[PDB]
């Protein structure tokens, strides 16, 4: 963009993303693309539960979109807010990760939670999938857990894998535990 | 004399984009210069990955080749109309004199 305010133009996007992740969590955040021209930015949040975002009869979408304007004044320029449904949340690494990260917060058996997630992802589409859990499994000594199925092989190797990757954290009384989700789809 | 500069990462994204602009303006202005290529410059930058902040220690090498396209349009008129609404591809950043 502008030499002068490319950075300024950028700071705002972080600002927008900041709120969406905070609010939209229940909705199931996947990605927030931000396209722009002059004072009219795109922001099309992708969600598993489009309903949660929209609100009833689009009541919430109004508040949020309005909240956006407060942050994005005329100078930032009014922004829209498109929302697309995520077909099969099961495919989104981000979701799959978040999904496991939540269960871990619950205190579910991590190894199993991992199996299940690989199974769900594996179960609907996905040529291959793999999940990784950080350490402090069961609030135990730090460990690592795995689990994978299908060819992640032919992925990892950069050549047009089209492997969605996602990481999800998990705050816990015991400590933070990162979760990694890899999903393999038809390559290019 | 509206010099148009079209730059983009993808060679196709421009060929499509700049081409559109050629056809449109043909309607209300002179006959465009025709999309001139302007060679592609590659930039190699070795810098801190992030801006001043986390991991000043980080580095990394980047090469980003960027493509250009002028297609000048002299004797302007309602060129502006056909151009303004008409654009398409994202992935292109166009600036005009």
């Amino acid at each position: 963009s502008k030499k002068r305010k490319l950075v300024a133009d950028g700071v705002f996007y972080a600002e927008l993303n900041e709120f969406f992740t905070r609010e939209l969590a229940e909705e199931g955040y996947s990605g927030v693309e931000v396209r722009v021209t002059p004072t009219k930015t795109e922001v099309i949040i992708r969600a598993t539960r489009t309903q949660d975002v929209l609100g009833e009869n689009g009541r919430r979408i109004n508040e949020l979109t309005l909240l956006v304007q407060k942050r994005f004044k005329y100078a930032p320029g009014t922004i829209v807010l498109y929302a697309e449904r995520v077909q099969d949340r099961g495919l989104s690494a981000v979701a799959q990760a978040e999904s496991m990260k939540f269960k871990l917060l619950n205190g579910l058996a991590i190894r199993r939670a991992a199996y299940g997630v690989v199974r769900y992802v594996m179960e609907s589409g996905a040529k291959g999938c793999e999940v990784v859990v950080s350490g402090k499994l069961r609030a135990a000594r730090a460990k690592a857990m795995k689990f994978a199925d299908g060819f992640l092989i032919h992925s990892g190797q950069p050549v047009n894998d089209f492997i969605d990757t996602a990481t999800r954290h998990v705050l816990m009384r015991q400590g933070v535990l990162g979760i990694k989700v890899k999903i393999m789809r038809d390559p290019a | 004399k509206i010099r148009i500069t079209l730059t983009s990462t993808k060679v196709k994204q421009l060929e499509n984009v700049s081409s559109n602009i050629v056809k449109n303006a043909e309607q209300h202005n002179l006959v465009k210069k025709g999309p001139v290529r302007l060679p592609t410059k590659v930039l190699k930058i070795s810098t801190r990955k992030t801006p001043n902040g986390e991991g000043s220690k980080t580095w990394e090498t980047y090469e980003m080749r960027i493509h250009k396209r002028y297609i000048d349009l002299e004797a302007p008129v309602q060129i502006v109309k056909r151009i303004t609404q008409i654009t398409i591809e994202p992935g292109v950043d166009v600036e005009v004199v």
């Binding site: 490319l6 950075v7 950028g10 700071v11 972080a14 990757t165 | 810098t47 801190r48 990955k49 992030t50 801006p51 001043n52 902040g53 986390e54 991991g55 000043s56 220690k57 980080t58 580095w59 990394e60």
Partner: peptide, 29 residues
């Protein structure tokens, strides 16, 4: 810098990132 506030070395242009690290981090995904 702007995000992380690591002063140690943020590029002006982005004027963001912890430093090069966050610059690379954001870039990474």
């Amino acid at each position: 810098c702007r995000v992380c506030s690591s002063h140690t070395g943020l590029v002006r242009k982005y004027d963001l990132n912890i430093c090069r690290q966050c610059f690379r981090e954001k870039a990474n995904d």
